[PDB]
Amino acid sequence: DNLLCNLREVQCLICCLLHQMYIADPNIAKLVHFQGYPCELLPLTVAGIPSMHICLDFIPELIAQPELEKQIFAIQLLSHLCIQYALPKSLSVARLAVNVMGTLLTVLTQAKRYAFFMPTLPSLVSFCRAFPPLYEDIMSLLIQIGQVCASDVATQTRDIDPIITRLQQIKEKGSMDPDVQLCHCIERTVIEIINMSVS
């Protein structure tokens, strides 16, 4: 069910308490999000805790951190917040996030590129859903990432070689290469962006 169970009630109670604690001290919310938590709880916390609109204040600071995991968490948190609170400040922070993604696309190595872009690419669907003005920047960034990853695929011999496929239909759903996996992830997030904007 995922909605009609004791787990949902417990999540609501915990969200109420966390709402109270964040109201009492927003610095606790900032510290918790700098620590991070599993991203499976992100829609839960964003929907169930009204205090999270303050998270847009320290997301630009969290993005600036040198840890890759903190930046990944900032991107995912911003995506969920943008889904919840579609505001001009949210749009500005989303623009900053896309700019940061484009910037460190040319800073991260191949392993770092895989590690950063596998969790944060589905978040780009949320920015497109919330902000149609980001269509140009997000599609341009996706084209850049796809071209970089296609180059990386061409660098070495591959078990799949997605370069020569080139014409696949919607391949709806293993221990594969990171580069072909990232290529497939780019294709899938582009498909999700298109389907949302056409259905």
């Binding site: 609170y85 579609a86 505001l87 001009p88 919330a130 902000f131 149609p132």
Partner: protein, 107 residues
């Protein structure tokens, strides 16, 4: 649109005219639903991709814009669609508080 502009000018200019201008717009929308339908997002300030701020529920000009848009909505299925969330909330209130100006709708 020009009538709305002049009526809101005469709303901010003459408070004692509020009653007759509310009633006026109640009758104006009931007659012209088709002409109000393009002007509905022109007046509600519904941004396409942003949740807009909730307008002051005590502002007489705004309350008269809702009266007009709700009397027009009575004849126009397509008007309930373009309502924002706060528009539905505000509707539920002025139907109870001002049932003689606001008509029952089919939301």
């Amino acid at each position: 649109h020009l009538a709305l502009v002049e009526l809101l000018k005469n709303l901010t200019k003459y408070p004692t005219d509020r009653d007759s201008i509310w009633k006026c717009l109640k009758f104006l929308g009931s007659r012209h639903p088709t002409l109000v339908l393009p002007l509905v997002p022109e007046l509600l300030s519904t941004h396409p991709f942003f949740d807009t701020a909730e307008p002051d529920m005590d502002d007489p000009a705004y309350i008269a814009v809702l009266v007009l848009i709700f009397n027009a909505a009575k004849t126009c299925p397509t008007m309930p669609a373009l309502f924002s969330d706060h528009t539905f909330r505000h509707y539920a209130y002025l139907r109870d508080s001002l049932s003689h100006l606001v008509p029952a709708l089919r939301l």
